[PDB]
Amino acid sequence: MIEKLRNIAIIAHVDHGKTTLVDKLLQQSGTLEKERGITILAKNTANDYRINIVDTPGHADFEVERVMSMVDSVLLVVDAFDGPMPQTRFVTKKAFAYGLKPIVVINKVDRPGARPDWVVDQVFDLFVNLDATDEQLDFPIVYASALNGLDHEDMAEDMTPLYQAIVDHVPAPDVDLDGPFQMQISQLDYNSYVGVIGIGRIKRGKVKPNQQVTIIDSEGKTRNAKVGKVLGHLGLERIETDLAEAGDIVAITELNISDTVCDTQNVEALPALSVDEPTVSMFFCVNTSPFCGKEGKFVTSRQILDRLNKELVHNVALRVEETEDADAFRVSGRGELHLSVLIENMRREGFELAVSRPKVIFREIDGRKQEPYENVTLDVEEQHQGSVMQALGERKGDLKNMNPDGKGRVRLDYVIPSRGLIGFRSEFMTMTSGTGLLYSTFSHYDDVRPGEVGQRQNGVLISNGQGKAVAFALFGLQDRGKLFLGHGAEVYEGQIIGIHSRSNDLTVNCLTGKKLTNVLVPPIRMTLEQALEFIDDDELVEVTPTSIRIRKRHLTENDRRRANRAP
Numbered sequence: 001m002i003e004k005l006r007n008i009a010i011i012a013h014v015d016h017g018k019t020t021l022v023d024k025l026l027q028q029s030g031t032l033e034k035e036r037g038i039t040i041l042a043k044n045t046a047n048d049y050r051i052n053i054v055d056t057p058g059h060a061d062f063e064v065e066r067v068m069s070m071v072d073s074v075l076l077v078v079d080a081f082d083g084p085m086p087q088t089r090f091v092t093k094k095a096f097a098y099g100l101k102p103i104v105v106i107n108k109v110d111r112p113g114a115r116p117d118w119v120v121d122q123v124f125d126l127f128v129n130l131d132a133t134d135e136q137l138d139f140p141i142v143y144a145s146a147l148n149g150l151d152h153e154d155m156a157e158d159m160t161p162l163y164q165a166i167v168d169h170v171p172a173p174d175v176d177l178d179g180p181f182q183m184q185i186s187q188l189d190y191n192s193y194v195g196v197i198g199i200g201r202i203k204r205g206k207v208k209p210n211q212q213v214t215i216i217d218s219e220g221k222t223r224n225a226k227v228g229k230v231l232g233h234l235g236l237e238r239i240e241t242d243l244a245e246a247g248d249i250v251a252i253t254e255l256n257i258s259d260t261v262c263d264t265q266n267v268e269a270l271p272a273l274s275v276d277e278p279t280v281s282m283f284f285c286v287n288t289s290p291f292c293g294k295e296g297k298f299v300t301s302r303q304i305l306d307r308l309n310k311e312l313v314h315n316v317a318l319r320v321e322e323t324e325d326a327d328a329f330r331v332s333g334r335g336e337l338h339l340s341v342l343i344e345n346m347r348r349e350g351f352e353l354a355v356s357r358p359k360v361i362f363r364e365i366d367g368r369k370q371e372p373y374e375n376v377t378l379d380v381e382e383q384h385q386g387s388v389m390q391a392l393g394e395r396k397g398d399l400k401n402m403n404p405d406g407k408g409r410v411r412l413d414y415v416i417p418s419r420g421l422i423g424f425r426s427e428f429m430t431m432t433s434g435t436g437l438l439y440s441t442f443s444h445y446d447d448v449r450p451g452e453v454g455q456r457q458n459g460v461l462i463s464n465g466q467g468k469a470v471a472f473a474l475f476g477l478q479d480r481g482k483l484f485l486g487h488g489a490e491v492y493e494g495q496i497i498g499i500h501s502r503s504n505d506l507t508v509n510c511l512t513g514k515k516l517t518n519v520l521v522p523p524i525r526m527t528l529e530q531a532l533e534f535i536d537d538d539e540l541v542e543v544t545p546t547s548i549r550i551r552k553r554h555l556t557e558n559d560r561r562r563a564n565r566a567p
């Protein structure tokens, strides 16, 4: 059966000449339910050619590689009155960046002001300038009218020859039925009633709604109960699915993009990242603080994970997974910002969650463990080199360049391990007095320092009871350290309320003070951004739609000491 399978992507755009095609192919198979689709799997014969025409987003999201890592060739579709358009553009790049061999299709030649030839000329000039190098052919180049003249052929039925064009040029999916089973989860969708659903194209072997499998990068042992799969415009189930079909699989682990399934007996694994992988992961936990659901709306773990998976569909740099703890999730993203947008949004929506310090994703590449470094670019005034020298140095900031712009200012490019960039933005502001300007970007995974840079020089000031903030306590607490609150705010035991000027943590009291027997400094505006860059392993950022709070993982001092200690 394998040899007559056909997997392709489509491209269209602002031009209403897309599909049309799909709905026009109707000369197919007129002999659960959701979701579909993804991918209009027709069925041309005159033998049963199974033709997944998997659909590509003209929307350029946070992507399309993760489609075409399933398909083997492509349909570019273009109207004959206007030409290829600037995100028929983007999409197709990623086509040639895999070994894909485009089938051009000209639509709506029925149009009056038809430029059938000129469009093909215009393709090359805006499609050829992308190398391949093959194609060329690209021949392929079929003419069409969705509302089904000159040039090819013409014309029989217009749609009667298209089928032959796809079968002729588009190869069989080069994957092997024998041996065990394995499949890379390429696409991904969610439903609140069946969890996250696989969607990949099978790389070897066969499956059947109850078995066992395993999930790749570390452990992953879980097994599902059901397998949807594409059939016409439907997404039906059946007894089993063998090789090279864009089939889709429910109820496993969380299941993730790039991540690859495979039998437990003599298997594992699959490669391909490709580059959208993430570099950081902070844990998301349900707000276990005293103000549990007192400022939000959503808070029970079920809702958080429902939201996280709603994000796992369209957001592609995001991978999420589960822990030992019920109410905890390792949420991994391309950057620290990539995550903090998800938080800031979940906040705005009504959520309440506690979040761990962004720890980086250390990765094993060629014997040498490697940690992610980042290109860091920053402008400052001349009286802030003296400060930004020491900081980035202290965080293993290899200095690339200086562009002193004549006047006072100077620009500075660096490379830093991500691990050492965590923290820094709040200091660049605190050193430059806001007049510093800085953003940075992921560059590469290279060997580790390793040592330990991302480490706060200070300790934190923690209240030991719930109550309010007595100004007659806090006037004489800001003498010991820098302060996060002021004139009477509702707090609790475990809650962090400032920074000690040295390294030891003081568990002071913010309650009655006292009075005896028988002005306050304006506090720090800790943004979500910088509460995250603030915390330690033994600290969490609790967030409510209205408020940012920062607390120790374990509250009760005695309880925290009982685990540190160490072994």
Ligand SMILES: Nc1nc2c(ncn2[C@@H]2O[C@H](COP(=O)(O)OP(=O)(O)CP(=O)(O)O)[C@@H](O)[C@H]2O)c(=O)[nH]1
Residues within 6 Å of the ligand: 012, 013, 014, 015, 016, 017, 018, 019, 020, 021, 107, 108, 109, 110, 111, 144, 145, 146, 147, 148
């Ligand atoms: N004359 C002519 N018009 C066509 C042809 N194919 C499509 N069209 C025009 O374009 C529209 C096709 O509808 P539609 O299927 O929504 O196009 P589409 O590409 O799917 C729009 P979207 O980009 O949102 O997917 C119709 O309004 C129709 O008049 C064709 O072969 N000839």
